[PDB]
Design a protein around this ligand. Structure first.
Ligand SMILES: [Mg+2]
Length: 230
């Protein structure tokens, strides 16, 4: 039976309308006064990271700090603004301020907790992951936090799911994984036997609904699915 429920972080629990805001303010901070539109830097930044996250998918871990910094240095040299050494520090500050949870998050974690092992599986560095959960105040709502730094590999590599299943002591078939990336989340968890639930609040990922077992648009639908399976 289902004795565990695992969630992704970005795009699943934190409001993308909140991450987007934070990132804009990060770039505004880095610039300010400099004759470059902050929104233009943001879009170029997102393009570069997207490519970096694409190139490391399912491969050996490498500090996200070094990756994201190679990108900013690239952009600073390209546009001529001062590379902020405290880029990593400024990033966190803006997250803790403008980053927020989707409305039903606490509600859902509470229900699943107690009766089912509740864990997190993220590609983020371990320290970044802790500070983040601590900022949104949901650290103690999890029984386990599993990261790529700990597994040595990024999603969808199987090792990051295996490790989370071990920390829990359950078998893949006895576990569920909730995420918003059809291939990285659902495709990855699937290789371990886990039951996959794709979150798609905007109803856009219709094109990739088949790669997943279930499709929800509100995390409250997960408690339903679980019991239905038990
Ligand atoms: Mg995601």
């Amino acid at each position: 039976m289902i004795r565990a429920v695992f969630f992704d972080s970005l795009g699943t629990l934190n409001s993308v309308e909140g991450a987007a805001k934070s990132h804009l303010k990060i770039m505004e901070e880095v610039l300010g006064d400099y004759p470059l539109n902050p929104k233009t830097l943001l879009d170029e930044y997102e393009k570069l990271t997207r490519e970096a996250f694409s190139n490391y998918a399912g491969k050996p871990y490498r500090p996200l700090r070094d990756i994201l910094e190679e990108v900013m240095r690239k952009l600073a040299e390209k546009y001529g603004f001062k590379y902020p050494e405290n880029f990593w520090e400024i990033s966190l500050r803006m997250s803790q301020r403008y980053g927020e949870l989707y409305p039903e998050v606490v509600e859902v974690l509470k229900s699943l907790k107690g009766k089912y092992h509740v864990g997190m599986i993220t590609d983020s560095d371990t320290e970044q992951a802790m500070a983040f959960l601590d900022a949104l105040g949901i650290k103690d709502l999890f029984d386990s936090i599993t990261t790529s730094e700990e597994a040595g590999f990024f999603k969808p590599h199987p090792r990051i799911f295996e490790l989370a299943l071990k920390k829990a002591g359950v078998k893949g078939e006895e576990a569920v994984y909730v995420g918003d990336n059809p291939v990285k989340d659902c495709g990855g968890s699937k290789n371990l036997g886990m039951t996959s639930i794709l979150l798609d609040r905007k109803g856009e990922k219709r094109e990739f609904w088949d790669k997943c077992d279930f499709i929800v648009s509100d995390l409250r639908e997960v408690i339903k699915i679980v019991d239905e399976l038990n």
